[PDB]
Amino acid sequence: MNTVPFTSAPIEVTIGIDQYSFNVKENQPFHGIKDIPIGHVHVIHFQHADNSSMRYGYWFDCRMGNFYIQYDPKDGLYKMMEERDGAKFENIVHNFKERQMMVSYPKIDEDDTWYNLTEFVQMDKIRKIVRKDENQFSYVDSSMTTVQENELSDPAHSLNYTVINFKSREAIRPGHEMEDFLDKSYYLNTVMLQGIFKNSSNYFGELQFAFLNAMFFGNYGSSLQWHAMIELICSSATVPKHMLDKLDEILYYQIKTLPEQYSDILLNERVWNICLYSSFQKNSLHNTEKIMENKYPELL
Amino acid sequence: GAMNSSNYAELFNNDIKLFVDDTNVYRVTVHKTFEGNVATKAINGCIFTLNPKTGHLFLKIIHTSVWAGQKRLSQLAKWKTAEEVSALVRSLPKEEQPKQIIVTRKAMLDPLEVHMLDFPNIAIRPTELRLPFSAAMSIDKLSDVVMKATEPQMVLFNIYDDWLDRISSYTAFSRLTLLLRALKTNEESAKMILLSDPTITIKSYHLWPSFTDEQWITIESQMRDLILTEYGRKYNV
Numbered sequence A: 001m002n003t004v005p006f007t008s009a010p011i012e013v014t015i016g017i018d019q020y021s022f023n024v025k026e027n028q029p030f031h032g033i034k035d036i037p038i039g040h041v042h043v044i045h046f047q048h049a050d051n052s053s054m055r056y057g058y059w060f061d062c063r064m065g066n067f068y069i070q071y072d073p074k075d076g077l078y079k080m081m082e083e084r085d086g087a088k089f090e091n092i093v094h095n096f097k098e099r100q101m102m103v104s105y106p107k108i109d110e111d112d113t114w115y116n117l118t119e120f121v122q123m124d125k126i127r128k129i130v131r132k133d134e135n136q137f138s139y140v141d142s143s144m145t146t147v148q149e150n151e152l153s154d155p156a157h158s159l160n161y162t163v164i165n166f167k168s169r170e171a172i173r174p175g176h177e178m179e180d181f182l183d184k185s186y187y188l189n190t191v192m193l194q195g196i197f198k199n200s201s202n203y204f205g206e207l208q209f210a211f212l213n214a215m216f217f218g219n220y221g222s223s224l225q226w227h228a229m230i231e232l233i234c235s236s237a238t239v240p241k242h243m244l245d246k247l248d249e250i251l252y253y254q255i256k257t258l259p260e261q262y263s264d265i266l267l268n269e270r271v272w273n274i275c276l277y278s279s280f281q282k283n284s285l286h287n288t289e290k291i292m293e294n295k296y297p298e299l300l
Numbered sequence B: 001g002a003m004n005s006s007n008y009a010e011l012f013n014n015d016i017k018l019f020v021d022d023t024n025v026y027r028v029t030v031h032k033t034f035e036g037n038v039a040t041k042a043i044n045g046c047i048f049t050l051n052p053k054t055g056h057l058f059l060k061i062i063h064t065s066v067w068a069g070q071k072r073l074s075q076l077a078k079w080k081t082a083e084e085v086s087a088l089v090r091s092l093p094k095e096e097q098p099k100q101i102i103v104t105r106k107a108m109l110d111p112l113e114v115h116m117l118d119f120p121n122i123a124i125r126p127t128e129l130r131l132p133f134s135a136a137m138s139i140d141k142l143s144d145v146v147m148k149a150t151e152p153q154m155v156l157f158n159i160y161d162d163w164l165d166r167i168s169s170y171t172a173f174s175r176l177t178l179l180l181r182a183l184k185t186n187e188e189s190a191k192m193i194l195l196s197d198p199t200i201t202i203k204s205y206h207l208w209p210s211f212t213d214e215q216w217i218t219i220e221s222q223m224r225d226l227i228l229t230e231y232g233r234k235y236n237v
């Protein structure tokens, strides 16, 4: 069980750690989060009380280093940091715990939600898509744009999701125009899974990463990416049977976790109605279709 | 964006463009089988690809053999159309290739866009106009070459005959659309109007009769009468 220590909390803020959140008042004696499960990536995220604009946060894996949060009064945000002095960091964390100034990551023993949402998300792969290579953790916020948006503008502060475009030469083999546009199996299996991602684990990883960014920060480019990766699978007639079974579980847990009041913005009626009711895979997503129909029958 | 009444004179500027109409590509007769079920029998069709500035018509005849052994023929017909238009463009010298292709039905947009991915600078556009190009098969010489074809074939026409010697392309397109609208609303009456007078003939190298300027005014007026009329006999006004 690992710990993320805070220097202090100078400004009132709603802090989020994975799917949990709590409020810290301005200058409230608070020194961090303890009991963080080892073995998973995690995200610690922030919404200031005075400006609900700009949710922002940090993806991290406590196995890769000792991270602490320091509020910067010049840039006006809580920043994640690395302390290379292990001896000093361990001394600080112990001092904070003895003073009962750390909130406990509040995982229910029965509860596999976070595992199920992050099963194939990898930190080194996350760093490959956000190239601030000097840090072991990755910053994301509500405003960051994707390369697809950039085609239509700061390349360093962007999410380079894998580009998917159904009306592109990459997607469409010369002489197979109708075949490849109406059945995207070639693009899914040869171009993306065998030529870009390498395996389905990586495909699921970027799909899970795009959803979580869409959900925790309202990143439009992440929402677009999540919907595009679902649609590419559902629009393929030929999909490995284990991939379909796993996609159904992945989407089930994403829909289960989605805040009910954000569905209007985070769910795209066309993609979901096509995927569940028209596509090749309309009969292959039983768990996802059942929860969608019982939780969001209006969208459909 | 979409072509409409507001941007109508853009058709007659000097940027090369083509209209593509696919409504006569897949044509069938519906009939009863010996068992009393219903079946279709395909007949020859055509793609209507028209330069509205010059009158040049690229009439690609679609022979029924292209449907043999295929499924979902109405969907295939749109993709076949896009394949043939893309082949036509690639066959033209660069300086003759269109800058825009306007499709008369929105269901042609994705098939044509995908077939033309190699031509990113050619705009594929829909239209809000309800153009009467389906009536092209009411032009006797066009219908004749389509129905006589025994293999795939492209035939070139000028749908304006020699009108551009005397009128502008705006006026020629307006006359064409009026004639085709009339043939579409009441084919018999329209054709009676056009051929009633046996002294006005159709030249061998033309589609329409050799009307004088004055006779075209009379003709056009009679076609307007017909379209409003039938618009009466239809809505009872």
Ligand SMILES: O=C(NCCn1ccnc1)c1cccc(F)c1
Pocket: A005, A006, A007, A008, A067, A068, A069, A070, A083, A088, A089, A092
């Ligand atoms: O350099 C740090 N400054 C803030 C820590 N701090 C708060 C009270 N005394 C020291 C830092 C390094 C390791 C762990 C950590 F919590 C923070």
Ligand SMILES: O=C(NCCn1ccnc1)c1cccc(F)c1
Pocket: A022, A023, A024, A028, A029, A030, A031, A100, A101, A102, A103
């Ligand atoms: O949770 C504790 N501190 C973390 C601060 N915090 C901020 C928001 N909710 C909790 C804690 C609990 C009771 C007494 C106490 F001294 C510390």
Ligand SMILES: O=C(NCCn1ccnc1)c1cccc(F)c1
Pocket: A120, A121, A122, A125, A126, A128, A129, A162, A196, A197, A202, A203, A204, A205, A206, A209
């Ligand atoms: O494999 C991923 N993207 C494919 C492109 N890529 C990136 C690095 N090497 C290839 C990927 C991205 C984000 C999270 C994740 F779990 C996996």
Ligand SMILES: O=C(NCCn1ccnc1)c1cccc(F)c1
Pocket: A214, A218, A219, A220, A221, A223, A264, A265, A266
């Ligand atoms: O619903 C969203 N866009 C479609 C409607 N919209 C709103 C603003 N521009 C278009 C949406 C916006 C921001 C983040 C997100 F994940 C989804």
